[PDB]
Design a protein around this ligand. Structure first.
Ligand code: MET
Length: 237
């Protein structure tokens, strides 16, 4: 028009997650008269940078381990505003339906950022594919492997490249953020799935100096409404 409405920029991930954010934005307008503008991203390392730089007022795409790690490596100054959902990561495959009877020497693809790499290795261990040292935490790496019976080779790739990895490796642990973009769900296609209970619940994060504002708080509330939840269930099969 000739003048625009006052809006708040929320950063989210393209695809399934943006669809969920769309409903939240819908609920935010009806309940709080909060006009929201979704800003979709395709890479995990961008959202916090945008938030910190002032390009967006908040984002919804990460879990605490990831945020803490990124704040430590770049010094962003952010504060958690509220929890969203948990997306139990899963291992998928266009070749096998089970982990037992996985040929020896196979390649297994996993994300390469530190917190999701560690998460994947922990998950593999739960499958009995490998064993990690006793004191390893949430940041395990290949240097922490103390047992590898099937002689597996861990291929670390950028999270957004894991979908396409299914065509080159025996099995890939993919964030639902991307697995959904190729119509895969843990419940329907997962060879194995991470437990619901874990430290990976997603969050709505804002800057340290704006987290108190009702704009941030209200969006958080809208995202936790029954409506959005219902829409989310649908969106993820
Ligand atoms: C940047 S960490 C992102 C986590 C991802 N959405 C998951 O829940 O698997």
């Amino acid at each position: 028009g000739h003048m625009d409405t006052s809006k708040v920029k929320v950063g989210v991930m393209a695809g399934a997650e943006a669809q969920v954010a769309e409903v939240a934005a819908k609920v935010a307008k009806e309940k709080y008269g909060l006009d929201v503008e979704l800003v979709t991203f395709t890479d995990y390392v961008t959202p916090n940078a945008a938030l910190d730089d002032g390009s967006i007022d908040m984002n919804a795409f990460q879990h605490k381990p990831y945020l803490d790690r990124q704040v430590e490596d770049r010094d962003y100054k952010l504060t958690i505003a509220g929890n969203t959902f948990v997306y139990p990561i899963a291992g998928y495959s266009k070749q096998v339906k089970s982990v037992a009877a996985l040929a020896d020497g196979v390649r297994i693809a996993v994300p390469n950022d530190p917190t999701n790499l560690g998460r994947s290795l922990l998950l593999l261990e739960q499958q009995g594919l490998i064993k990690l040292r006793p004191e390893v935490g949430l940041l395990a790496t290949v240097r922490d492997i103390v047992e590898n019976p099937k002689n597996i080779t861990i291929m670390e790739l950028d999270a957004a490249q894991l979908p396409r990895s299914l065509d080159d490796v025996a099995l890939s642990i993919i964030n639902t953020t991307y697995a959904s973009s190729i119509n895969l769900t843990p419940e329907k296609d997962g060879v194995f799935v991470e437990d619901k209970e874990s430290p990976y619940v997603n969050l709505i994060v804002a800057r340290q100096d704006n987290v108190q504002n009702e704009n941030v708080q209200n969006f958080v509330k809208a995202y936790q409404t029954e409506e959005v939840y219902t829409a989310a269930k649908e969106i993820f099969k």
